[PDB]
Design a protein around this motif. Structure first.
Motif, PDB file in Angstrom:
ATOM      1  N   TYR A   1      17.513 -12.087 -67.091  1.00 22.76           N
ATOM      2  CA  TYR A   1      16.538 -12.924 -66.017  1.00 22.76           C
ATOM      3  C   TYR A   1      16.918 -12.864 -64.620  1.00 22.76           C
ATOM      4  O   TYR A   1      16.075 -12.993 -63.842  1.00 22.76           O
ATOM      5  N   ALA A   2      18.081 -11.661 -64.166  1.00 19.94           N
ATOM      6  CA  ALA A   2      18.243 -10.915 -62.957  1.00 19.94           C
ATOM      7  C   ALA A   2      16.507 -10.390 -62.520  1.00 19.94           C
ATOM      8  O   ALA A   2      16.539 -10.824 -61.606  1.00 19.94           O
ATOM      9  N   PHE A   3      16.224  -9.559 -63.663  1.00 29.55           N
ATOM     10  CA  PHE A   3      14.971  -9.501 -63.509  1.00 29.55           C
ATOM     11  C   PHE A   3      13.945  -9.621 -63.605  1.00 29.55           C
ATOM     12  O   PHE A   3      13.541  -9.261 -62.229  1.00 29.55           O
ATOM     13  N   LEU A   4      13.611 -10.828 -63.682  1.00 30.74           N
ATOM     14  CA  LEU A   4      13.108 -11.724 -64.289  1.00 30.74           C
ATOM     15  C   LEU A   4      12.758 -13.146 -62.560  1.00 30.74           C
ATOM     16  O   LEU A   4      11.542 -12.804 -62.251  1.00 30.74           O
ATOM     17  N   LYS A   5      13.839 -13.347 -61.808  1.00 34.08           N
ATOM     18  CA  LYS A   5      14.011 -13.809 -61.145  1.00 34.08           C
ATOM     19  C   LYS A   5      13.698 -12.915 -59.614  1.00 34.08           C
ATOM     20  O   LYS A   5      13.585 -13.262 -58.136  1.00 34.08           O
ATOM     21  N   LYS A   6      13.598 -11.710 -59.360  1.00 33.46           N
ATOM     22  CA  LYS A   6      12.530 -10.573 -58.835  1.00 33.46           C
ATOM     23  C   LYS A   6      14.024 -10.296 -58.075  1.00 33.46           C
ATOM     24  O   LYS A   6      14.302 -10.067 -56.907  1.00 33.46           O
ATOM     25  N   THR A   7      15.307  -9.959 -59.008  1.00 30.69           N
ATOM     26  CA  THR A   7      16.625  -9.890 -58.202  1.00 30.69           C
ATOM     27  C   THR A   7      16.831  -8.128 -58.174  1.00 30.69           C
ATOM     28  O   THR A   7      15.894  -7.304 -59.222  1.00 30.69           O
ATOM     29  N   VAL A   8      16.907  -7.819 -57.497  1.00 29.44           N
ATOM     30  CA  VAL A   8      17.236  -6.184 -57.286  1.00 29.44           C
ATOM     31  C   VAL A   8      18.716  -5.334 -58.358  1.00 29.44           C
ATOM     32  O   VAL A   8      19.753  -6.273 -57.979  1.00 29.44           O
ATOM     33  N   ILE A   9      18.265  -4.644 -59.072  1.00 27.66           N
ATOM     34  CA  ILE A   9      19.481  -4.815 -60.071  1.00 27.66           C
ATOM     35  C   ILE A   9      19.737  -2.845 -60.185  1.00 27.66           C
ATOM     36  O   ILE A   9      19.153  -1.916 -59.413  1.00 27.66           O
ATOM     37  N   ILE A  10      21.404  -3.159 -60.287  1.00 22.47           N
ATOM     38  CA  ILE A  10      21.984  -2.141 -59.495  1.00 22.47           C
ATOM     39  C   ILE A  10      23.192  -1.506 -60.710  1.00 22.47           C
ATOM     40  O   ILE A  10      23.343  -1.796 -61.516  1.00 22.47           O
ATOM     41  N   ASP A  11      23.489  -0.112 -60.326  1.00 22.96           N
ATOM     42  CA  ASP A  11      24.278   0.477 -61.370  1.00 22.96           C
ATOM     43  C   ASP A  11      25.852   0.569 -61.087  1.00 22.96           C
ATOM     44  O   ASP A  11      25.990   0.329 -59.698  1.00 22.96           O
ATOM     45  N   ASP A  12      26.825   1.537 -61.355  1.00 20.03           N
ATOM     46  CA  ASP A  12      28.461   1.551 -61.449  1.00 20.03           C
ATOM     47  C   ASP A  12      27.913   2.680 -60.345  1.00 20.03           C
ATOM     48  O   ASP A  12      28.520   3.182 -59.526  1.00 20.03           O
ATOM     49  N   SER A  13      27.321   3.794 -60.567  1.00 26.28           N
ATOM     50  CA  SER A  13      26.071   5.106 -59.344  1.00 26.28           C
ATOM     51  C   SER A  13      25.620   4.185 -58.178  1.00 26.28           C
ATOM     52  O   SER A  13      26.378   4.967 -57.730  1.00 26.28           O
ATOM     53  N   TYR A  14      25.478   3.790 -58.188  1.00 29.34           N
ATOM     54  CA  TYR A  14      25.472   2.868 -56.868  1.00 29.34           C
ATOM     55  C   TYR A  14      26.643   2.346 -56.143  1.00 29.34           C
ATOM     56  O   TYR A  14      26.642   3.050 -54.947  1.00 29.34           O
TER      57      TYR A  14
END
Length: 307
Positions: free
Chosen positions: A165-178
């Protein structure tokens, strides 16, 4: 996050990210995690205290800034924030831009809020990183909000509905690595803001060679438009996601909620009578594929011969 910059060379031409905590601003101060050297001769040795408070729960939803307290540290010519003299006991602010004049120094320190709100996929990751990002002045949460700039995903097995959902909403996605990279690098970021870990770079690294992501979120939008589906209660965020794919959404609850009316108005049933059933994970995997419409349509007609 609060970021300060200045005209001239009074902050050396580096912008500083001002994380929560307290900062002694003045000419006779060396730059460390609690100290900001301002290079102007007409400024007190210790001139101002910049205090940045922690975010409140509200800040996640409104996108509003952390409280920014300014105190004058017994200077000859005072401190002005937004053309108002900072009184004794200090002045504090929740506006998104601040113009700080320090004594007889014409070069103003300009403070601005670069909005950053991290929504999490999952309560257990939120428990892990809450304090950590609270102290980093990043409002955090589980729920949906218009302030959300970034999404932390869980990674594993198949990706979650929330990630899709976040992906298609054009949101920047992120790890715990970040999140780990942000915490080890915090100190350097206070001394130079250009050294803030590029979230977008980490996101692009996630999508690269990832079987659980399509080539673009834009190409998935309205890809299944013209198709009907029926689905359970299960996730408001799954309902919202399938709408982004262009699906006409019907909502059922029990086993015999499938009437004759449903069959003729519905192409497939979203799950988890002999009809076409799919989980959200399987539907995502069809969407990853280059021939999404055809695959679904071919299984629809194939099922028609079965019955």
């Amino acid at each position: 996050m609060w970021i300060i910059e200045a005209e001239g060379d009074i902050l050396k031409g580096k912008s500083r990210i001002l994380f929560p905590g307290t900062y002694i601003v003045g000419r006779n101060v060396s730059d460390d995690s609690s100290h900001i050297q301002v290079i102007s001769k007409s400024i007190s040795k210790r001139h101002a205290r910049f205090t940045i408070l922690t975010p409140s729960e509200k800040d996640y939803f409104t996108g509003g800034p952390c409280e920014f307290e300014v105190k004058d540290l017994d200077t000859k010519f005072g401190t002005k924030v937004n053309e108002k003299v900072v009184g004794q006991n200090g002045d504090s602010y929740k506006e998104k831009d601040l113009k700080i004049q320090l004594g007889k120094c014409p070069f103003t320190i300009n403070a601005y809020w670069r909005s950053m709100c991290i929504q999490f996929d999952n309560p257990e990751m939120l428990s892990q990183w809450a304090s950590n990002l609270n102290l980093l002045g990043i409002p955090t949460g589980l729920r949906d909000s218009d302030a959300t700039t970034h999404f932390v995903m869980n990674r594993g097995s198949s990706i979650t509905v929330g990630t899709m959902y976040a992906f298609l909403k054009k949101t920047v996605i992120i790890d715990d690595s970040y999140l780990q990279y942000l915490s080890t690098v915090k100190e350097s970021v206070i001394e130079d803001a250009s050294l803030m870990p590029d979230a977008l770079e980490c996101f692009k690294n996630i999508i690269k060679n990832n079987d659980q992501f399509p080539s673009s979120p834009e190409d998935c939008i309205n890809s299944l438009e013209g198709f009907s589906c029926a689905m359970l209660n299960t996730s408001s965020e799954s309902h919202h996601l399938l709408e982004l794919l262009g699906l006409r959404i019907s909502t059922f609850m029990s086993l015999g909620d499938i009437d004759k009316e449903l069959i003729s108005k519905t192409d497939f049933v979203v799950l988890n009578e002999g009809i076409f059933c799919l989980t959200i994970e399987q539907l995502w995997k069809i969407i990853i594929e280059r021939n999404s419409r055809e695959l679904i349509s071919k299984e629809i007609e194939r099922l028609k011969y079965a019955t």
